[PDB]
Amino acid sequence: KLLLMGRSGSGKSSMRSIIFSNYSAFDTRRLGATIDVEHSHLRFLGNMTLNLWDCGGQDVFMENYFTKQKDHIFVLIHVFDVESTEVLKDIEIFAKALKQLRKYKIFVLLHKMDLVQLDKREELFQIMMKNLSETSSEFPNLIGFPTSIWDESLYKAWSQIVCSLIPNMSNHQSNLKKFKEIMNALEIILFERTTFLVICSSNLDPKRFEKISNIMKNFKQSCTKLKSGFKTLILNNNIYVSELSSNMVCFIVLKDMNIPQELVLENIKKAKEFF
Amino acid sequence: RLKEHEHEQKLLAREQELRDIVANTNDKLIDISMINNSGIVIQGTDLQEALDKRNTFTLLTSPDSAKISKEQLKKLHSNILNEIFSQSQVNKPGPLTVPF
């Protein structure tokens, strides 16, 4: 289903714990090292349930995967610890996964990006990708992101990942635009309810959706202290977030800050049924 | 000294002056109970309000009694009321419900 792979220490399980199991960036340092493959069955959109093959990272396991379980094993999120002394190793184990994969969607994550200094982050991601894409051609076009636990770009990672397996894009984009129309918004965003990943934009900050994913994850993770789950939040009458469907939450931003609450919430509720 | 007297009375006068502000704000607030039982909103007629602004009339059947004819009254009545009703019609800018 979903292959979570990469050498030891690269925080595969750390990611799994954050975006899925709702660990925070801090608590994940607790996690014991993945022994063989830890499977995780969790649903997205209700309609599709996902199986997360959180593979082992240690070389013992790694070299085993391409041996007595190669057929068994064969999307692949392959992650990369930036600091690795043995870079060309990790490149070549990626190559090892690749050939067996022709036996049978590829995503590369430069994880732990929070460690390398801000200036040589751009340059360092560039050179690494220049390589991996060339290696990947044996696929023609490779898409992969810089990824850290300590920033929001982890969410933007999996957003562009999960939506790659969502068929609703044709239906939903049509069904969301048609909500933007009536509401006279600046934009509406659709997120999944539990994971908080971006599903769809309607129509001037570029890092909106990744950040919102983060801020909202943290309000919701914070809400536990009051002992109840998040439903709605209304800001300045400008910004509206509502729980909507059983497997959807919407971030609306209105153009006028005085269209009465009960109206927006009423229109939210009528639209709520559809999707 | 005497300066200390004067200033000490003041500080205490300012102190009570603050107690006033507190008490006024405290007085001014509203409860949800007050909302439920409040008799601010009551049924009203114009008869009532003029009667609280704070036998009388004798009838005449004689034909000679009227200074405006029955036909004059009829025309004024129909005129006033129709002007009111016509002036009372008001149009929606568009459909109040939308599809989707």
Next chain:
Amino acid sequence: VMLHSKNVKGFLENTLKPYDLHSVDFKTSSLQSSMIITATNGGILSYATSNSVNNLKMMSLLIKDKWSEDENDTESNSCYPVEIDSFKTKIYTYEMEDLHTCVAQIPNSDLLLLFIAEGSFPYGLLVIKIERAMRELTDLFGYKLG
């Protein structure tokens, strides 16, 4: 369906217009304010005026309270029954502070149309004003809150 805010603010703002009769020397002040509110809560859905937004939202809750109290009782005056296209409703005439108010339920719906005016503005006149305005809210008849 879902409600067109712009058109509702429009209608409500058109209802603010006063009367300038010259059958006689009769003329009214403009309607002070005018809202369509929820029948369930007494929360503003749309308003027009000739923080105050709160003062209104508040008044709404007070009026809705008395309306539902009156509306749900055993038994006869400051309440006009009205028939519109076989849809039936009640117009109520209240005094609140110094104001002349006038609330009628939009038939079959969870929406009350409520007018607020000056003391100078007579009740019997507002009754007409609201009834005649009501007759143009055909789009909303039977709107149950989502």
Next chain:
Amino acid sequence: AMVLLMGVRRCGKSSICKVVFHNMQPLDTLYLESTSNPSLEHFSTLIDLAVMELPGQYFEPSYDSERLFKSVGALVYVIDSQDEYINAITNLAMIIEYAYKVNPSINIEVLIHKVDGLSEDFKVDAQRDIMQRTGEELLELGLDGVQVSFYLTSIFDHSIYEAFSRIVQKLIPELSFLENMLDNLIQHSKIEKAFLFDVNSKIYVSTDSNPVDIQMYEVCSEFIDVTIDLFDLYKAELQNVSQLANGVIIYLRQMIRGLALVAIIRPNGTDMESCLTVADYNIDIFKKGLEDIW
């Protein structure tokens, strides 16, 4: 007014300064380097405070300090846990001797610091028996100044924020009125707890009578952070409401001088709008309250 923030060299003076005032990510304070010359972070809000770090090197009562202490509202000495604090206490008693000598009315607050990692039991264990050795070195020095104020604080937590709140609150003159005035706001409206926060600082100027369970302070602080984080994203008064499944409401409204009222509302069953409209009405008069104290 102003406050003296002193301690045993390299113990978390500049640390809590940067994290309280600049919302610094604390591991960036790990790489902070020794300020050897007295530095002061001003703080405005309701009172116009001024926090002055002193480098420290025992007490050494200098020539200037006689007026400086006579010019101090309150004194916050920070004792680093996880180091021999007996030297800190030996020194501390000498400082409070000078303060009390010069200005007898000084409020003395002591921060038991770097307590985050240690177990709750290890903390209780430390506190009950540090208080003892603190009053010990003072019993030897004349009478006992009733300045008993031990605030167990961790920079990596909400502990400092709560402490500093209780510290600054202790200085505010109009406080007694704020509490009772704010108190019966939350009595008329359906509010279990309300705090006046400095939005930037995250410390609180006033709360109500009912118990400040730190879980709740935490919710309100985190709420502020959320509303600001979201608001800052989109710019093309300042208020924020959120409702949870159980019906409870978190409310925030901008108020005079960088403050912001943040409150938790019980539904008790009623409509949200009714609760929100009554709230807004009361909070409007409340805003008129603290507008008419300045």
Next chain:
Amino acid sequence: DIKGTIAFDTHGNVIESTGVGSQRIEDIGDLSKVTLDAEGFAQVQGDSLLVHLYKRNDITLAVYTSA
């Protein structure tokens, strides 16, 4: 010469009032009780002036002259 008008419904409140009408609203009390002929008209005088009544469709127009 007309000195004022009141025009009221049968609930008690008023539809319009000009001249003395707006002042002497109290009259609707006694006025609404007046015995009308089969045509719906009446002439009454009670206070140094003469009121004329007409009632069409539950709406009475009262107009005012003098003695």
